[PDB]
Design a protein around this ligand. Structure first.
Ligand SMILES: [Co+2]
Ligand SMILES: [Co+2]
Ligand SMILES: [Co+2]
Ligand SMILES: [Co+2]
Ligand SMILES: [Co+2]
Ligand SMILES: [Co+2]
Ligand SMILES: [Co+2]
Lengths: 486, 485
């Protein structure tokens, strides 16, 4: 930050720390800053730490390190400035305040595993086909490799492919005899893939979640479950989805929607509406079909973010000490069904750490059954879709479909100022190039969703404001996250 | 709720349980914001800590101890915080006592009562004398002048609505002259609702709308070309932009959402900016009723904010300010520019003397606004206040009243504030009132000016009290606490 020695007289040193938000107009990940604390080092004796405009923040000294807390003052909107004055009595080899480190109210060691990248040879504007594909052999390799990923894809099955295992379910889903995973339309798969590349969220998990919450991504041969007749490979199936539900296929309540709307200003514009973004229709042209998955993912992501803000490094520590290989998925799903308050009540990272890290099956030992066996159902369907090597979902995409998709993305997400008109148009030109380039493999009439859409997405994301995942901020966020004691 | 956990030796350990008891939503109990908790003792405070780890900030001034929760001071539904206090026994009264929770709201906020129904009034079956205290004053035409700005401290008449449709002999939005008139009667119903509910002078809302969007004023000036309005065989031009989504009060969506978050008791979650604010040429549009109230709320919010930041001193200023229109100036200026402008002026802080000594507040502080906003609004308000010649009046059928209250139920409040039984019986009492004081006019209509305050009060005999809820929530706490005017 910006500090300055105001005066050194006698043995006391007076330093002015200017903490401020510089931005006047909205910028990416700079609309509002939330500061948990400000740490600095000194060997001298701290006399007093006060605000310049009256009052003093709460601080405490542990050896060489001093931690300053802003408490209720820690909210920095646009064009906000707070000056802090520090007095120190000169002592030791290094008495002057130094090594200032502002700790934002966010997971300092949060983990978002990279799925894959474009070749370093890739350039904006005019690129070649070899600048899109690192290795055509693996890029078109059909062979399906099994994986055991839950909510977050730490270890991707393939860096450039989309493995959505449309597996058959041999165990009860919503009290059914059996079930079969299928995708309603391709635009929803585009949404799943966008959430996958952007937020590193396993699409199979969103499939399981939607299927459990509203039969959104699953059908069954069970006669009791009567609904829309879906034909797959000369086989009649019943789709008991409630397509008229305003909470969408992910069952997102309006309260949660508005809350995560306030949490992420960089993602959700002010004109956003619950029913518009979530409630889908039988018509695949509905915008919601694309917006519904991402939003859900965001919500899920939010929960994770929250934990990273409350537990910090310890979170990651748990990940290497937990015997249950599905623990994170369990916690996140359970928190999605019940609420973050349920997670806070479980107190895994607090009072009940030992039982948590020692239990081989986390969701059984904590009696977190959810609503009608929610957690185990979601986990099981996710794992089953992960193990599927026989049949993987694929789709054909025309250019107008891509245009439609990105137009929808521009219309429903982001905020004026994040991406101006120029480089967005240029972005669409680069996506045009990419499309026409790797469509020559299929005959220039279509591109493969599974094989190509990750590449398309990455080409499109070469222009997206980085860091790609913005920090959840704002008023509500600060105090809902700071009060969080899991 | 405090309790002596243990007294051992000379140290006393007390457990203070601070919590929100409500699980389902209730009126003015959805969220509690606590600035501080004060208690008295003569002993020596050893330590004040939270039960779940950490300690709040406190300080002792003699017998009084002030506890501050800071970032912990937000209490949503079903939230509980336990605080442990240790005190060393000393003096005549050592035990913690006289606990006083100071909510983050004006402790001495002033909302002057305009008038009341007779104490003889009962729910269900009442008489005509239970509605009218004195028929003489109740139907007295004679118009008494007044000098009220934003808040009606001294009402001209307790049961009447004096909307002075006066002629303006000075420039409003660069016009040669202007004439105040009401678009439709439903908007007047809205103005009156804001008047009885939030104690806001309807003339002020008239001036505000007129200045912001020509919403309540017409002119004979030829340059100002627009919709032709005929009043008493006289052609007038109405240069209102009826297609503006910000409504006739020019309320930006940001402000709308902010005050939407500030008042959970007033605005439901499904509320939309364009739906509530943007009106149309058709008087049947719901916005025509919702637009004034909302605006008033916004205005009220500003005032509330000051009451939270300055407290008693606010009222003190009211009796020390030489300018009799100071509050109106500050509120209007804050509405045009923003509360940040008021915070920047620092009247109650660094520049108190010049503020209370200046006879004309808005001239000495150079707060001209946008194109002379403040003085225009003040002048139009005062002119409408001085008007005794011609007062606005309207005729109301029962279906109009039904429409009004249905709109109110649909657009405002929150599920749980007023149950169905409560509303249905209320509407029956309003039916009774209507039919009762319609017998004076022939049972075909009721007078807006003379009767609608009575109707409103009859309807408000069932409304959840206190009628004006406290602005609360996350945004409110820290936007109000950071406020240093
Ligand atoms: Co604990
Ligand atoms: Co083909
Ligand atoms: Co990138
Ligand atoms: Co804020
Ligand atoms: Co000051
Ligand atoms: Co009452
Ligand atoms: Co909150």
């Amino acid at each position: 930050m910006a500090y300055r020695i105001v005066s050194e007289t006698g043995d006391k040193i007076t330093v002015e720390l200017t903490l401020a938000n510089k931005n006047t107009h909205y910028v990416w990940n700079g609309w509002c800053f939330d500061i948990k604390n400000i740490t600095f080092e000194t060997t001298g004796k701290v006399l007093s730490i006060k605000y310049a405009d009256g009052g003093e923040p709460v601080y405490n000294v542990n050896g060489n390190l001093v931690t300053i807390d802003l408490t209720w003052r820690g909210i920095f909107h646009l064009n906000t400035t707070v000056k802090i004055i520090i007095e120190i009595q000169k002592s030791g080899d290094n008495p002057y305040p130094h090594n200032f480190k502002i700790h934002y109210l966010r997971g300092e060691s949060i983990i978002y595993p990279t799925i894959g990248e474009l070749p370093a040879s890739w350039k904006p504007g005019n690129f070649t086909l070899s600048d899109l594909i690192a290795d055509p052999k693996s890029y078109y390799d059909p062979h399906v490799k099994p994986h055991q990923n839950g909510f977050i894809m730490y270890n991707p099955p393939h860096p450039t492919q989309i493995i959505i295992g449309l597996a058959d379910i041999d165990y009860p889903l919503n009290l059914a005899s059996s079930a079969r995973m299928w995708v309603p339309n391709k635009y929803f798969a585009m949404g799943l893939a966008l959430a996958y590349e952007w937020f590193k969220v396993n699409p199979n998990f969103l499939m399981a979640l939607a299927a459990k919450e509203n039969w959104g991504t699953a059908v069954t041969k069970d006669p009791a479950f009567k609904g829309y007749k879906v034909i797959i490979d000369e086989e009649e199936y019943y789709w008991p989805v409630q397509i008229d539900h305003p909470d969408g296929i992910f069952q997102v309540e309006s309260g949660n929607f508005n809350q995560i709307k306030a949490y992420y200003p960089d993602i959700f514009p002010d004109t956003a509406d619950h029913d518009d973004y979530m409630k889908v229709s039988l018509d695949p042209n509905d915008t919601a079909w694309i917006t519904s998955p991402i939003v859900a993912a965001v919500s899920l992501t939010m929960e994770r973010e929250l934990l990273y803000a409350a537990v910090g490094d310890k979170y990651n520590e748990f990940l290497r000490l937990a015997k249950d290989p599905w623990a994170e998925t369990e916690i996140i799903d359970f928190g999605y069904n019940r609420g973050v308050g349920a997670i806070e009540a479980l107190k895994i990272f607090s009072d009940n750490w030992e039982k948590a890290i020692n239990a081989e099956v986390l969701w059984k030992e904590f009696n977190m059954e959810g609503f009608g066996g929610h957690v185990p159902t979601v986990i099981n369907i996710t794992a089953t879709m992960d193990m599927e090597t026989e049949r993987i979902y694929d789709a054909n995409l025309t250019w107008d479909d891509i245009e439609y998709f990105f137009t929808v993305v521009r219309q429903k997400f982001f905020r004026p100022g994040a991406i101006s008109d120029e480089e967005w148009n240029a972005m669409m030109r680069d996506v045009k190039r990419a499309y026409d380039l790797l469509s020559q493999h299929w005959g220039g009439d279509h591109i493969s969703y599974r094989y190509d859409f990750l590449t398309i997405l990455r080409v499109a994301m070469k222009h997206w404001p980085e860091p790609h995942i913005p920090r959840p901020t704002g008023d509500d966020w600060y105090y809902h996250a700071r009060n969080y004691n899991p």
